[PDB]
Design a protein around this ligand. Structure first.
Ligand SMILES: O=C(NCCc1ccncc1)NC1CCCCC1
Ligand SMILES: O=C(NCCc1ccncc1)NC1CCCCC1
Lengths: 304, 304
């Protein structure tokens, strides 16, 4: 009972965090096997950062200009390469704490945990979603670059995010672990505007099911709707369209609560049209969209 | 930039979690040095649970009736004792992953991280506060008993909470690591009502400072107030009274923002009197009270 914004336990990722120094820039790296992953902008002098040519800047850099410190022990760099916007530093020592892992590129609406780090050391963990405009609304200060986002499935860490950038609007931009930015952003100190931050409709539905499972039912109404009618309303309210793929993924929550997905859609529709009237659902005065259907099933069934 | 509900990294506590079985009841234990801490109700048959005499039930229990499994390796129990509502199982092996630690009893309004565990295995981490009625609003299913709440200061884990009980209202009750319940609750299957869940005023103020630091300023007004006038309003709105001790602890946030504590009090007063008018602060449509002043300073200054 109770429904909390919950992060994956951070221990497996804590054991991968190192400090990368190049010149006067220190940020965080991810040490997996004998490779340290970090943002390539580690090589920039924030005067470079205005219009960097990373290939050209990298010519001036050797293995020994990359300082990699794990705990307070130095790793020997025996190779370096650039993959998109990340540097891969080959070290002479495989991380003895390497978990089973994958690199996954997630879709907008997918949630993950961030281990916020400074100087290769963890400060905190929180739950995030990839916004539909491919930003995340994180908590990141100077020195946090290289901090990673991840999901855990039993023993396997899926790394989905590395932190690169703060947009001038104070939202956050970064890469998958192959160094490809989510969204159109570039690792450059240039004004870059984010698109519309729409609500992740499928996630709101999942969280309305979590609320029903936990006893919060006041918002359940006598209406149903169709996919097309609901989507007209979603559009008007800057909600992502709902697809049959979203309806399918919600099946187990529909199943447990006996509330048809389109019925829950008609309940959400009325919440958009009438607002909450000063009421709360699961202790929130607005509709939470950073729980996936998978996250609700996980938390509601006690998965480890 | 950005302000997130943030938990301490969970790795140091993950390495302490074990599974305790007694009879047919399995829950979680905390293994620190050569001692495993768990809720004493592990020895109850939920028929015992109606009116248990723990001393009497413990007479029927030997070292070998307590099954303690760490990973999938069994610990040999060489002693057991009861301290208030917890059992202390002496094992023959000191936990090699024991962090530096303390047991602390926290006050209502203090925040901590919970590592929710099932069968000695972590499922997730979230941030909590000890409510002023000495409940916490957690996320806990059957098998979660023994899950702990904690704070970290650099390398030292302060354990403040062990999970014992779900009240019939779906809020949560438990002990410090000396086995003393927060609040008046007893480890018994008997209807136990929680008192008024008032808002932690000092924490709301800290989070209003965090909002100002992060650019959310719309709620700042032209008024100030006094401690006595503010407290009249707090009382009317089921907010905890504000003391000079709360004002003192807020000093650094006052200092950075140049907003006198009593000025921020007058801003909160107007938010209580006028509500948010459909506006948000730090992405919330209500006033968050699960950030302490210490938590705001920590997150806003990047402490590891
Ligand atoms: O340097 C910065 N932001 C750029 C650094 C950064 C990088 C990735 N994520 C978040 C932040 N802010 C400073 C802090 C102190 C006050 C004046 C602005
Ligand atoms: O057994 C229970 N609660 C008691 C167990 C418990 C203990 C500590 N925290 C939280 C929960 N609920 C069951 C679950 C399945 C549906 C019917 C009620």
């Amino acid at each position: 009972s109770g429904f909390r914004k919950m992060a994956f336990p951070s221990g497996k990722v804590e054991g991968c965090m190192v400090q990368v120094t190049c010149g006067t820039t220190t940020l965080n790296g991810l040490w997996l096997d004998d490779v340290v992953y970090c943002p390539r902008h580690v090589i920039c002098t924030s005067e470079d950062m205005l219009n960097p040519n990373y290939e050209d800047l990298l010519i001036r850099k050797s293995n020994h200009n990359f300082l990699v410190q794990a705990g307070n022990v130095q790793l020997r760099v025996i190779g370096h390469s650039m993959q998109n916007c990340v540097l891969k530093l080959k070290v002479d020592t495989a991380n003895p704490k390497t978990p089973k892992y994958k690199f996954v590129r997630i879709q907008p609406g997918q949630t993950f945990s961030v281990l916020a780090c400074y100087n290769g050391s963890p400060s905190g963990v929180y739950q995030c979603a990839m916004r539909p405009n491919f930003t995340i609304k994180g908590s990141f200060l100077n020195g946090s670059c290289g901090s990673v986002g991840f999901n855990i499935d039993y023993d396997c860490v899926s790394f989905c995010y590395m932190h690169h950038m703060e947009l001038p609007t104070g939202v956050h931009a970064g890469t998958d672990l192959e160094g490809n930015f989510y969204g159109p952003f570039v690792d450059r100190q240039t004004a870059q505007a984010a698109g519309t931050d729409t609500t992740i409709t499928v996630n709101v539905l999942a969280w309305l099911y979590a609320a029903v499972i936990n006893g919060d039912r006041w918002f359940l109404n006598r209406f149903t709707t169709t996919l097309n009618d609901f989507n007209l309303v979603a559009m008007k309210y800057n909600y992502e369209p709902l697809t049959q793929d979203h309806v399918d993924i919600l099946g187990p929550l529909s199943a447990q609560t006996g509330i048809a997905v389109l019925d829950m859609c008609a309940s959400l529709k009325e919440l958009l049209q009438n607002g909450m009237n000063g009421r709360t659902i699961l202790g929130s005065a607005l509709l939470e969209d950073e729980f996936t259907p998978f996250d609700v099933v996980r938390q509601c069934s006690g998965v480890t």
